[PDB]
Amino acid sequence: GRQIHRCKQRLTRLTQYLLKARRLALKHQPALIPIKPKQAHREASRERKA
Amino acid sequence: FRKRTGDIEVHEIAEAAAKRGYTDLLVLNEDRKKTNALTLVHLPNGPSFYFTLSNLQTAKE
Amino acid sequence: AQGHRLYVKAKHLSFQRSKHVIHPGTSIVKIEGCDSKEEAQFYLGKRVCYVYKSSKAVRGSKIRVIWGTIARPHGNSGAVRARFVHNLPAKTFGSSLRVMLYPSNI
Amino acid sequence: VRYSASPALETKCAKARGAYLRTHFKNSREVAFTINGMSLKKAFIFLDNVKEHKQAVPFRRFNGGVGRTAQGKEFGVTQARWPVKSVKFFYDLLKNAEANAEAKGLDMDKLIIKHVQVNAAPKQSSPSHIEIIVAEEEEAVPKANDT
Amino acid sequence: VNIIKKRTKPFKRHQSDRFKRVGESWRKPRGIDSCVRRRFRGTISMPKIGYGNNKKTRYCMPNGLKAFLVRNVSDVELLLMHNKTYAAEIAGNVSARKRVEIVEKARALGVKVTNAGAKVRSQ
Amino acid sequence: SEFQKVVVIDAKGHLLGRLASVVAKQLLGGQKVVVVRCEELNISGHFFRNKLKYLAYLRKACRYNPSRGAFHFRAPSRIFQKAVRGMLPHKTARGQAALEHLQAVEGIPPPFDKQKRVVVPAALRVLRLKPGRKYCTVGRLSSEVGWKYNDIVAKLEERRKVKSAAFYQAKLAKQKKIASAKEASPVNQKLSQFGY
Amino acid sequence: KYYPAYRENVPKKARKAVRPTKLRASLAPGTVCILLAGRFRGKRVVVLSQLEDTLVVTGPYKVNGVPIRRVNHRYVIATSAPKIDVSGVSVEKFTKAYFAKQKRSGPVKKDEAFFAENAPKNALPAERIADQKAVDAKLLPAIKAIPNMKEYLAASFALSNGDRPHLMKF
RNA sequence: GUACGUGAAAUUGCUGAAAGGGAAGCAUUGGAAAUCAGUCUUACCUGGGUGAGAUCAGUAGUCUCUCGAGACUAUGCA
RNA sequence: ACCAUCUAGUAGCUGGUUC
RNA sequence: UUGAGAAGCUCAGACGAGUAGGCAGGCGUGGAGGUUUGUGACGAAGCCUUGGGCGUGAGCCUGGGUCGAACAGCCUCUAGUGCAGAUCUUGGUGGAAGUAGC
RNA sequence: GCGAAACCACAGCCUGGGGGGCCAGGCAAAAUCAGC
Hints:
This is part of a larger assembly, with seven protein chains of seven kinds.
Chain C: E1 9-17, E2 22-31, E3 47-49, E4 51-58, E5 61-65, E6 68-74, E7 79-84, E8 97-99
Antiparallel strand pairs in C: 1-2, 1-8, 2-7, 3-6, 3-8, 4-5, 6-7
Chain D: E1 13-21, H1 25-35, H2 40-51, E2 57-58, E3 80-81, H3 85-104, E4 111-119, E5 128-136
Antiparallel strand pairs in D: 1-5, 2-3, 4-5
Helix pairs in contact in D: 2-3
Chain G: E1 32-35, E2 45-50, E3 54-58, H1 61-64, E4 68-72, E5 76-78, H2 126-137, H3 140-145, H4 150-154
Antiparallel strand pairs in G: 1-2, 1-5, 2-3, 3-4
The structure holds four RNA strands.
Subcellular location (chain D): Cytoplasm
Family (chain D): Belongs to the universal ribosomal protein uL22 family.
GO molecular function, one term (chain D): structural constituent of ribosome
């Protein structure tokens, strides 16, 4: 009974992952774009020079 | 000034804002309690511009 | 301004203390007109406060407030022993409080 | 060069600096903190009186054994002296303080001394670094009536 | 269970405020001449086992979820069955691209990433 | 039962060390105490009792720059102000802020002539002292040690009384009119059954 | 609908099962009382009946402007002022769902609502203003019988310097 | 910018805000100012109708494994 | 007198001996 | 009923200063084998911080700035492995002071 | 005009009581110079 308990709990936990990542994929959400230290130290350098 | 509430997207805003006599539409886009970018669209089909604000200063400073 | 004042004037007296050890988590309050530790059983449980006036204004006004209640009588002279949600600052000795008459049981 | 002052904008300001100046550090400072915050052309009329012993500069911080004068009470300070070598160096700088707005094309008769700095130097005595900021006085436009 | 702390001010080695050679990390004094060792009243306190916190609400953030360093995209996967007792803290040296892919997947597992906002400005 | 923002304690007939202890607590309580006729305070013990107890205090000065020693103040007001200075933690920030709430003066200045003058029933001489005892009056005492302003205040206070007496008869004649008008209002006598 | 997930943190069987609540003896239905905190503090009102915890009180709305409110029985000072007859008023119309708030309920806003804003002015419904005239009409003659009672209600309560609430009687 | 990779502490000057009646230093409890974090963003759950198909077909084929277990390609989507 | 080398001459002892 | 890392889980009581001393468990630093389908020019290590988090603590994790090529967790092996002090060694910098003085 | 160095736990008011610091008191205003 211990082992079958796990499988049913990892079925509740894998269905909640697909029932969420499908709704999550259908919403419109912002774009996580990376910052870059080489190109934000260049801007700050050329700003005050310009 | 109309603060964006809840689930609405920019493309649905522009068509919903042109019908009430609006011309352009700015969007201040902060992150982590600093404003970093600014986009303005042109209604209802005009060119949309994505600048990024930098070296920000208020009026008190 | 005599059609107001639904509280009782009081004065914060001191912290709870011994000679050398003071216990700022519980205060001493002297209610007006309460001059016996048997006449202080009427003000047991009332919700007292401490109203003051800060300089910088937040939420359209300036008055702030620290709530709290009254727990025990204290001594033979009608003082009580109060307890506030934030402990009262030690620079408020001899100030004035308000002992609001609720929760009223009379 | 990266300077220590938030002012000295490109708009109405100009800067000069002087590094590795073989003077004392505790002597140009009290000069520097006296000339600070003043107008430019007045500072010239000010310091030349120091060169002819017509005005003494107070010694506030490094007041070691400075004898009392009669004119130190113009600012309230008890002790003052007439250093001549350090103020000779400041005149050299303030010429460059002029001649930099003279090349940037500013307005010269609204020009104040905004930020004078005196630092130490790599010891060989007690040499000095100096940087100076001269700026226009940032005038104010009268407000438009009502709305 | 509401999290609680027996102490909030950390311990601070004796006279590590006056001298700049002496660091602030705690070091038990070793001399019996000491005022502190004999525990004179008025002097600073000491780390003891008395200030140990609850054995169930230990290691927990004030929210209630314990932390977990996820340094790549398959370290947040283990937190699939533990999304209500662990918060996926991303490690510091992870690049600002490999970071933006942990967030988009931890969000599917309902896992709280504590510092998902680093290096990631959204548009 | 008083939390006035300002109290005026007329001090004729009080004891010094018992009023200075009643007052010292009300200062720390937050009030603003004015003690008028401080010159007519009393002290247990006969005339020479505190006299050598204060002539001894004159023999006590520093032995370095004797203009830096103890300042033995001679006024009847500062005699009692001294008494409320050791009763308070005057070396803290709460002592020296309490002491500026106390204004101890002699006679009655006109800013307090026209106000109420409460007394302390726990420090009075006719209560706390056995009848037929030895007692000395401070303002009569400190004159013999240097307070050279006795003959003026005794003259000044005599003028204030007869003026205040003239104030009283006009006030006494005022309520004799309302004494008639109180019973003349008929509602008082049939509706006194609410105790009044 | 789902198999229970991790950590069966099932509560134990709680022995706490509240029984009838019982108010004071001074809070009889129809007893004039004093109101201590809120907005209508100081205004003396009259109780209609006792609810489970709160009271269902009203000032006669013509006399004071106090509508039919609920007041927690602790922020009311009971008073031995002379009583009235509340047998004519049907207080059983009021229940714990009568004074329930109007259910925000999130009616569909047609998300464009971000731009266009409206307001129902949350006006008191026609039922509330109607019964306010009704219950007052069947108690105003009752307090008209007791002298000094119509003008007792409209005044307020305010203790004064020179008074001390414990030794005074209510 | 050759006083040159990163550039700590002591230490020095300027600027900003404070504090300072012949001692600061620290510990405890709180006021005032400044500022920071918290998922709260929204999510959740429940019927009908409309369309999509697949693990459905009173269905036809391929391959790898072991009758059927997965991966598929059709065709319908009852 | 000085210079190296054995020498890392000599403690019963004086100071110091690191989470 | 799943709580079998049996080196785990669980129930109940008493107890709690500590010197010389005895015992035990851990924290951290440089290198070595194994391991993380390990992190890294979209910025590794370091450094600074009026930011947040954990541990009783030694310590660790992290946001921001700086910066520019390497680096870490886990299990073992190994030691030139931890500093407040020695009129400690070397280096740097102060008050005395622009005083003593030329 | 040039310009040290010794020295440097932190320091700096008095009285009494167990010394600069403790207890209780007297008191207490910046910033400096010359005798001492």
